């Protein structure tokens, strides 16, 4: 009996310039058991504990002040507010690479919307698959 | 209403009110204890033996670089019921400053590992420089466990 | 639990390679050729961490990669991947994890480019759990 747990694993679009845009219609990417992708956000179908996670990979050629941020955020349907669940900031300054992996476990409610965002889509690297992704897993 | 997991889990966050310290909270938006995990005297208390993922992120920040050399540490340690003394499980150390008389710098430190824990283990997550901790925003500083 | 599950750890005693030792292997999961073998079809959480250490910086530009690949029972495809540029000892972890639909017989690898910079506790591992 295949699992009926809500899950998603969405991957960023390498050819969407100036954007961090999530896709499910790609190999090894997934929306299942009720999770939707709407206006670049993952929409939670039932209340419960979830794992939530995201990775980005940044890359520059040398150093010109560069700040890199990555942030997962929650909009609760009741509260109608957008607040940071998981967030990091790096100041990296020959090519440099900065990956940022965020993960944690959270109580969410039906209708919650989650986003995963960055401040410098121009520094995103897409050289290989699996470098830039966003997901949730119902416990 | 699907069956909740009964696995012990916790994700606690820095108290953004407690400037100059690192105080973990579960009584805070988007922080949690479940299935027997407790937060007592700033430590996480394990309700049953087994493998757990233990993770923490802290974010340090400064305005330029000072005359004394800055060392930033983050340490997760274990106090077992059978040996009630802090033992380091995970640690890291960073030197954010490698400035003539002031650009901000940020140093995020993540610690993660999978460990066999015992019932009643107390887990601490601690830094040496709370004066450099940044809680300008939620989601930056946290400490959690997930029983496998 | 009947769910396939594995958590394997790196041999701190191997020479310039990343060798996984079984740590858990249960309910059909196997370790063959340093790869995990999927006993049945479905959703898996897959996760890994590796740690790197070096004493100071060299004149070769050091790039550290870590990558988890799916080898279809049916060819190797990245599922999860990252890269760090480390350049006084320095220390750098790389940590990965996500949820994937897999098929009976798929193999999974967890590899690095520079085993000579491995740092060897409770922190170098590879694993899966059926959801
Ligand atoms: C880098 C890493 N190391 C890991 C080690 C273990 C697990 C993990 C997380 C959950 C879990 N289960 C099975 C047991 N009950 C809880 C769900 N089992 C294992 C996740 C791990 N991750 C990735 C990760 C970290 C923090 C939160 C979520 C994570 O993974 C997932 F979200 F992709």
Numbering used by the authors:
A (entry chain B): 7 to 70, 73 to 101, 112 to 157
B (entry chain A): 5 to 102, 105 to 107, 111 to 157
C (entry chain C): 9 to 30, 35 to 86, 89 to 101, 112 to 144, 147 to 157
What does the original paper state about this entry?
TNF, like most members of the TNF superfamily (TNFSF) exists mainly as a trimer with a threefold symmetry resulting in three identical receptor binding sites. The mechanism by which TNF induces signalling across the membrane is poorly understood, however, it is generally believed that the process involves receptor clustering. There are currently five approved TNF biologics that work by completely blocking the interaction of TNF with its receptors but to date, there are no small molecule therapeutics available that disrupt the high-affinity TNF–TNFR interaction. Small molecule inhibitors of TNF are described that stabilise a distorted TNF trimer, reducing the affinity of TNFR1 at one binding site and effectively reducing the stoichiometry of receptor binding from three to two per TNF trimer.
Recently, we described small molecule inhibitors of TNF that stabilised a distorted conformation of human TNF (hTNF) by binding in a pocket within the trimer core. Each of the compounds bound hTNF in a similar mode within the trimer core, resulting in an equivalent degree of distortion in the trimer. In order to strengthen the correlation between structural observations made with the mTNF(UCB-4433)–TNFR1 complex and how they are likely to also apply to hTNF, a comparison of the binding mode of UCB-4433 in human and mouse TNF was made.
